[PDB]
Design a protein around this ligand. Structure first.
Ligand SMILES: [Zn+2]
Ligand SMILES: [Zn+2]
Ligand SMILES: [Zn+2]
Length: 178
C-alpha cells in the first residue's frame, strides 16, 4: 500500500484499500471510510467493479440522458467518485469551504456553493437525480467566474471546472464528440 493519501497526497492516519494499493485519510475518501468492513475496497475499486460487471456501461451516452437518471446506488457512487476526483486536484482548496464576497466593483452570487456543501448534500441523500449534483458542481465554477471578472484569479475556476468536466465525461461514459 501507498504511504500517502490518494486525494491530498499527504501522510498521516491512513486507511489502506484491500483490493488496490491506494490509501486515504478518513474524510478524504468519499464516502468517509467505513467503521469496520474487513476486507475494505475503496471507491476506485468499487467503480472498476461496476464497469467489469456491465462492460456496455462504457458505451457512449448522451449527457441529457445521464442528468435525468435517478440517484440509485450506482449513480450515487459515480457522483461521489466524480466529487472525489475534483478534491484530488490541489486547486480544489479554493472551492472547498464556504466563500465570502467583498470585492470593490463586484456583488456576490445569489446562490453560493462550495465542495463541502456538495459533499454534505451527497452524504444526506439530498439529490434525487444526477442533474442536482452536476448543477451544484457547475454553479461553483460559474459563481467564481462571475465574481472575479477580469482578475486573472478567474482562471482557477476554469481550471478546476476542466478537471470536473473531463472526469464527468469519463465516469459517466459520455459519447465522445468534436
Ligand atoms: Zn487526504
Ligand atoms: Zn482500491
Ligand atoms: Zn451483463
Amino acid at each position: 500500500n501507498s504511504n500517502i493519501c490518494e486525494v491530498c497526497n499527504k501522510w498521516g492516519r491512513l486507511f489502506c484499500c484491500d483490493t488496490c494499493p491506494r490509501s486515504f485519510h478518513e474524510h478524504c475518501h468519499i464516502p468517509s471510510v467505513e467503521a469496520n468492513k474487513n476486507p475494505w475496497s475503496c471507491i476506485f475499486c468499487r467503480i472498476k467493479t461496476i464497469q467489469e460487471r456491465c462492460p456496455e456501461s462504457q458505451s457512449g451516452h448522451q449527457e441529457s440522458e445521464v442528468l435525468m437518471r435517478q440517484m440509485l446506488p450506482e449513480e450515487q457512487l459515480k457522483c461521489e467518485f466524480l466529487l472525489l476526483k475534483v478534491y484530488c486536484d490541489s486547486k480544489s482548496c479554493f472551492f472547498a469551504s464556504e466563500p465570502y464576497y467583498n470585492r470593490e466593483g463586484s456583488q456576490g452570487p445569489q446562490k453560493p456553493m462550495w465542495l463541502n456543501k456538495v459533499k454534505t448534500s451527497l452524504n444526506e441523500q439530498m439529490y434525487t437525480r444526477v442533474e442536482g449534483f452536476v448543477q451544484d458542481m457547475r454553479l461553483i465554477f460559474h459563481n467564481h467566474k462571475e465574481f472575479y471578472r477580469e482578475d486573472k484569479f478567474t482562471r482557477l475556476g476554469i481550471q478546476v471546472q476542466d478537471i470536473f468536466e473531463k472526469n464527468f465525461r469519463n465516469i459517466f461514459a459520455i459519447q465522445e464528440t468534436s
